[PDB]
């Protein structure tokens with residue numbers, strides 16, 4: 811059902827993650843980690859302390875879709891296992907140097923055509939698919955966007971809830 815999902819999404823904050831390639835979203839799904847530019851890293855660290863849940867909604871550029879969404883389970887931490895991100899042009903491993911741990915809530919795709927009815931007040935009420943990496947999505951829009959994804963019945967939200 812959708813009852814545990816709705817409980818996880820209660821009073822969450824939502825951020826749009828735009829990845830340049832599929833490899834890094836694949837790596838993030840396998841290892842439960844994400845990294846972003848320092849300006850977004852600062853915003854996510856602030857948000858993590860302020861809300862019961864911080865939700866990352868992933869979209870690979872040019873794919874026409876979202877590739878799933880995940881919950882921050884920590885602030886960014888430096889050092890540790892060194893993620894072999896595939897770096898876009900102009901990206902260095904230092905720009906992507908802060909590493910967050912994430913718990914996946916849905917690993918399924920959602921095509922942009924299914925979200926055309928949702929607009930984001932925090933981006934001039936443009937459709938929610940439009941936004942730069944790190945764009946915050948307002949509560950109601952973000953909640954409805956997450957509810958549009960196909961259910962991912964491989965994930966048990968019980969352990970996710972046992973972290974909030």
Ligand SMILES: CNc1nc(Cl)nc2c1ncn2CC(=O)Nc1ccccc1
Nearest residue numbers: 828829830831834845846898899900943
């Ligand atoms: C693992 N993390 C990421 N992996 C990928 Cl592939 N793209 C990402 C990631 N975090 C943000 N973006 C979008 C982005 O900032 N692109 C970019 C900006 C400026 C110069 C070059 C490329």
